[PDB]
Amino acid sequence: RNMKLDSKTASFYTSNPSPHLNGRRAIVPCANVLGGGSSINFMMYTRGSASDYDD
Amino acid sequence: AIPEEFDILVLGGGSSGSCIAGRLANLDHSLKVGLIEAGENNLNNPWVYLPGIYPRNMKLDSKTASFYTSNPSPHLNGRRAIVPCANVLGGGSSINFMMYTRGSASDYDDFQAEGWKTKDLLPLMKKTETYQRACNNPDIHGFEGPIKVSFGNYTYPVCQDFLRASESQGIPYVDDLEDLVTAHGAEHWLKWINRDTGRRSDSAHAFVHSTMRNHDNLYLICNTKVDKIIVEDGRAAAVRTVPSKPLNPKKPSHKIYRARKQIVLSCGTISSPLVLQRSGFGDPIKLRAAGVKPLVNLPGVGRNFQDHYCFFSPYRIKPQYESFDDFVRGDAEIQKRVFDQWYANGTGPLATNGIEAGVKIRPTPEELSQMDESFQEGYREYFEDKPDKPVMHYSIIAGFFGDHTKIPPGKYMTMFHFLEYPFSRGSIHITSPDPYAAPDFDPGFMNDERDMAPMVWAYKKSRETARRMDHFAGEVTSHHPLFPYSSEARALEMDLETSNAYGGPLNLSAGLAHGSWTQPLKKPTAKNEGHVTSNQVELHPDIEYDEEDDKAIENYIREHTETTWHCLGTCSIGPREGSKIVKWGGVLDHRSNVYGVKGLKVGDLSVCPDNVGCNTYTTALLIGEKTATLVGEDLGYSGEALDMTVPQFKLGTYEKTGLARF
Amino acid sequence: AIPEEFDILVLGGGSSGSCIAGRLANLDHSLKVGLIEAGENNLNNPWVYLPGIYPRNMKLDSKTASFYTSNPSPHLNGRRAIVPCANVLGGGSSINFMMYTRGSASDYDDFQAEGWKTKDLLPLMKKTETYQRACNNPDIHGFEGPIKVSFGNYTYPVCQDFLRASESQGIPYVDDLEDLVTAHGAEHWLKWINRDTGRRSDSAHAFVHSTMRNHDNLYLICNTKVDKIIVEDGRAAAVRTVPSKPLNPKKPSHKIYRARKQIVLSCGTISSPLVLQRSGFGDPIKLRAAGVKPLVNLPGVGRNFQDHYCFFSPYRIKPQYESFDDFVRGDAEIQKRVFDQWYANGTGPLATNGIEAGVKIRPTPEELSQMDESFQEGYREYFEDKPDKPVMHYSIIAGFFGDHTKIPPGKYMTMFHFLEYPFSRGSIHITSPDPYAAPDFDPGFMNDERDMAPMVWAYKKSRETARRMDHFAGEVTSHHPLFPYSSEARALEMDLETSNAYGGPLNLSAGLAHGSWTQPLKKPTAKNEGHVTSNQVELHPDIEYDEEDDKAIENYIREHTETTWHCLGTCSIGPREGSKIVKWGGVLDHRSNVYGVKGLKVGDLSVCPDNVGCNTYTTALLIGEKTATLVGEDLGYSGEALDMTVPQFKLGTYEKTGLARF
Amino acid sequence: TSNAYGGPLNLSAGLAHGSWTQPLKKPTAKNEGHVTSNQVELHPDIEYDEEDDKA
Ligand SMILES: Cc1cc2nc3c(=O)[nH]c(=O)nc-3n(C[C@H](O)[C@H](O)[C@H](O)COP(=O)(O)OP(=O)(O)OC[C@H]3O[C@@H](n4cnc5c(N)ncnc54)[C@H](O)[C@@H]3O)c2cc1C
Ligand SMILES: Cc1cc2nc3c(=O)[nH]c(=O)nc-3n(C[C@H](O)[C@H](O)[C@H](O)COP(=O)(O)OP(=O)(O)OC[C@H]3O[C@@H](n4cnc5c(N)ncnc54)[C@H](O)[C@@H]3O)c2cc1C
Ligand SMILES: [Mg+2]
Ligand SMILES: [Mg+2]
Ligand SMILES: [Mg+2]
């Protein structure tokens, strides 16, 4: 529910149109509640490769 | 109780065959007419006589249809269209959508038969139906025929909108589009529904079951598929039959009925050529492939198959508006009220065919100029010459005629379009001696280049008239042509607040959009102030097309057209030597006698050389009464009492007698 | 199917226009009468023929009404009253509350036309309705007319109480208040409901749709708003029309119908003067403002507009008593039974108009003495002279006619009062050439000082008769005049225990009162012992008023009166030069011909010079048959068969034939 | 909103007779070009005179 367009808890920034997306203008939603996206997220857990932080 | 030797056999339970059977039994009484049908009896069958459950009859697992499957074709993008056929007594009259309409006067003139002219057939068309509608042109519509025609006992409010929308597109509103002399028009479409009862008006109850109660001399042999027509000494004196379903593999059964003076094929345009071909009527070369011995040389059997090309384009409707979509969905609580009102009263949503209004069309040359040059070339020869003929038709259905399991939940209004006179010509042929074996055949949809332009143009037209309706909420994009994603011609979905209106208070996903599956529709331009409140309108922007947006509509039509069951041709009138209208040569004589044999006649809707720009049911009744009259004179019976009235308790207009209205 | 040139055009689908259309088509059959209407067709429309869903038709978003809005006026305290007009075929007969009543005999005498006298119109009034009621005065009511009138198939118990309450106020109970010769009275109010079926008795089904089934020579052109009446060589030979809704902005459309011998305006009293003015009939000075060229000088068009001034005052009813308030609320479970009984039987709450009883009134001089001196001065000239005329009317509605979203939940009985002959006179005028443009007009409510006293006095009267009813539980104070808070004249609410009776067992706030929003009502005086149990009564104290309690009622009436849709005037009979009854001058001749032109007639209810103290529907039918007869003689047709019976299957009284009762 | 409270089946939602109450005007349209979370739609400010103070 947190992801609905009329939803209060998100900002839904909209991108400039691009040919690469076939003229599509993808929205780029951002959290808008205290605790940020931790209050909104899908709660997936995972951890990155050790090479990443080395990068 | 059943004898072996009937006086006049009438193969088939088709609407035309029920016409011939009922009318024929009536003329002499003494004469013994036996009717043979490959399907179940339908007397007092709830699923037949009550109109509002028509879509069910078309289910794939449905008993009442045969669903023949075509050979694959490149023109349909490798698609293998099924071509369903009726399988119940009364034929397609027990199954049909109950649309009423009548063809152009030029059509019957196009048969160019020694008879069969419109001037001659007008009284016969007049004899076969009563006309419950408030007729203005009473010099054409019959007023006391066995079969009843009306607006039904319920009316979805969609029709007024469709008329106000169509009227703004330069399409005139004509009170009667069945006048036989019109191209452009709009009308509140008529239905084959008995308004006085709310029952379906199929030919079986009107002709066959009404005669059998009254007269002893009629025999109904349901559940016996025809195999072959035995012929000897030049006369067709027998017809061996097999059971419709082979339930006893070890000991197959058959029976040979005998006809003393006449035989008649009313098996429909698909089954009939097959039955002639199993008897050996066809090319010896084509027939040796199935091993049948060729008795008579009739190349034209099975050839010149013809259809109409319907295709459906649903548009979502606003939540506040009525639709039958939730009855056929189907809910256990809505459906209960919908029946309960019909038993209690006779007037409900159940007592109406779904379709509510429609528009025959003949394009303006200005808009015709942008059509592909091939179709312009076809238009000059075919329609330029004749003014009467519409090029294409579409109506509107107050619901979604299709599989509701596969479409998002909501209420929809679906446009229905079928080409009036497709140029393309198909064929059909038996592959095996066995009755049960499926024929290989090519319907030949879109076989000719010229058939595409009107289709695309009617989609472009119907979308615009569905965008001007008050009901409109947004296209259902999954069932519309696959336009490029950025296109302004694209099929937009319903608004966000309407998404909440369908989703309910408790939904956790209404306007949530991820993956950009669908584009929300923009709000309508604001109503003008200073206009009368009744005249104010709020309207969506007109859309415009380019080549890449046309190719999409084209692929859509190629991948989603199907038969409209207005199939006809195969066995058809013409010279045995051949003619321009029938290149392979005809098989019937103008008196409907099959060529090369004595005593065999065809009562099928197949008889027509060329398309009738109307729904085919009326021509079925008409051809059935033509062949009936022909059998009558063939028996030498006098023109006095040659007319063959069925028993019926005629009901007058309610103001003429108090016992006839809803 | 529709021709361009009708023999007798009849613009408008109003109840009067349906009268003229049906009657006219009938006289010759051969004659071609075409009717043009700006609205949807209404044949077999459930929302029209069944009576009990009348309030819905009045919703602001409702399709079937136009809702014209007036210029602001100081007299209404800056209020801008809407003035709704019917927008469906059959006009307001498809929308009305179905109240039946008939005007005083003095009224038709007041037209002082060369014809149009009551003595002459009595047979014509007699020809237009059958009278389902148990008539006592059979020398006046018709008994076999097309339109049926009755008490309906259901009766709320409110009426007996209203009669026993009214009878105690010195108001006599008269069996027939439609006698045409009465002032004081009370009656179980009649309704325009076909008792034999429970359907609404609109003029459209009775005249138009009953003729069209039977006769070919009638054309219905629904959904075409009139623009203008073309006139040349002194004859009105054409009427260009535009679509009712402008759905195609880039290419506006129009069509010009032709009338060979006659034309007729039955567009209602609002639309008609507009249609004449667009044609150039009016003051050149007023018309140059809209740029229309003045063809004929008719100052009186648009002038002398007249209404009635209804205003509603709800009173709460006890929980144990029946009301339609919970059906229109509307519950999904009550409403289901209310329909189910109607389909199953035909007799239910749905089969009745809401209003149940009512009282015409002419004040006693003793109580007249306290009325404002201006109204006394008006009474002497206007009513002193004539005994027949009531000054004001009110009835009772067994529910709340209004927005239930905005009122507390419960069951209510609402008093309805409308002034019989308002002194005030309005006007109307087109501002633009465009058909769609909203006219500027002043209904002129309360424009004259004299119109206030009867209003206040009837509120004071109706409150007292609602306080003596057995049903009474307490005024709903939010919808009653804003008396000073400490006043003994104040509108009290329901008792505490009744508050618990409506709140349910589980409510957490029944008698809780904070902020003193409302005052609880005191208990009724105890029933006398020693009286027969049936004669015992318990009664609330009489209330009394002072100047500050009168100013409140006055402001209430100023801020809450509205049109009762008994609008008439505008184009009206009188000398072209002018008359005392029509100061600006009349436009019609006594033969209903419009002045200065040949071949144009008006069939609208607008024709009346002055108010008829009755609901306007009957005068609509009557004027429609007057103009019908006038067209008949104008065509030179013989007085033999000049009467124009519509087809109908007459039903007798049930004791005369077994096929007619509920 | 009157229809939203009245339910689908109501026979009297926007019906107004006697002018008991005045419908509220629609809020000014949300500005485009603001972040979706910062957009606001707002009713006009009201103003008073002596006769509106006595009430
Ligand atoms: C789903 C559906 C919807 C339609 N809707 C409409 C509509 O709304 N309006 C309209 O005008 N048209 C409509 N039609 C088309 C119309 O009903 C047909 O054109 C018409 O019924 C043709 O009648 P017929 O007599 O030629 O063939 P049929 O009605 O099919 O008669 C053929 C009969 O012969 C039987 N038969 C076939 N083979 C054999 C055999 N070997 N032995 C014995 N019996 C055999 C079949 O079982 C069938 O009963 C619709 C058709 C379908 C099927
Ligand atoms: C809500 C309602 C409740 C009422 N209840 C009662 C009642 O209970 N009892 C009673 O006696 N009276 C009642 N009436 C009043 C009564 O119905 C009217 O007085 C009567 O119908 C007047 O009829 P008419 O023929 O003058 O006008 P209408 O009935 O309005 O006829 C006018 C017709 O012309 C059409 N029209 C207007 N302009 C044009 C144009 N430019 N072009 C084409 N067509 C146009 C309109 O659409 C309409 O159909 C009620 C009215 C309203 C509307
Ligand atoms: Mg983030
Ligand atoms: Mg078929
Ligand atoms: Mg009116």
Residue numbers in the entry:
A (entry chain A): 57 to 111
B (entry chain A), C (entry chain A): 2 to 663
D (entry chain A): 499 to 553
Article excerpt on this structure:
Here we present a cryo-EM map of Pichia pastoris alcohol oxidase at a resolution of 3.4 Å, which has allowed us to determine the structure of this protein. Unlike the other GMC family proteins, which act as monomers or dimers, AOX forms an octameric complex, consisting of two tetramers stacked face to face. The FAD density was also well resolved and indicated an FAD conformation typical for the GMC family. Structural elements unique for AOX are mostly located in the C-terminal half of the protein and include, apart from some short sections, a loop (364–392) including two α-helices connecting two β-strands of the 5-stranded parallel sheet (see below), a 75-residue insert (477–551) and a ~25 residue C-terminal extension (637–663). The AOX-specific inserts are located at the periphery of the monomer, where they mediate the inter-subunit contacts and form a tightly packed oligomer. The most significant oligomerisation module is the 75-residue insert 477–551, which is involved both in contacts within the tetrameric ring and in dimer contacts between rings. The FAD is buried deep inside the complex in an elongated conformation as in the other GMC family enzymes. In our model the space available for substrate molecules near the active site is restricted by large aromatic side chains, most strikingly Trp566, Phe98 and Phe402. In AOX, the dimer interface is close to the FAD isoalloxazine ring and the substrate binding pocket and the conserved side chain of His515 in the 75-residue AOX-specific oligomerisation loop appears to be part of the substrate binding pocket. Loss of this interaction in the monomer may be the cause of the observed inactivation of the FAD-containing monomer. The crystal contacts are formed by helix H12, which extends from the side of the octamer.
The first step of methanol metabolism, the oxidation with molecular oxygen to formaldehyde and hydrogen peroxide, is catalysed by alcohol oxidase (AOX) (EC 1.1.3.13) and occurs in specialized organelles, the peroxisomes, where H2O2 is decomposed by catalase. AOX is a member of the GMC (glucose–methanol–choline) oxidoreductase family and uses a non-covalently bound FAD cofactor. AOX catalyses the oxidation of small primary alcohols using a two-step mechanism, first a reductive half-reaction, where the substrate is oxidised while the FAD is reduced to FADH2, followed by an oxidative half-reaction, where the flavin is reoxidized by O2 and H2O2 is produced. AOX is with 663 amino acids larger than any of the other proteins, mainly due to a more than 70 residues long insert near the C-terminus that is thought to be involved in oligomerisation.
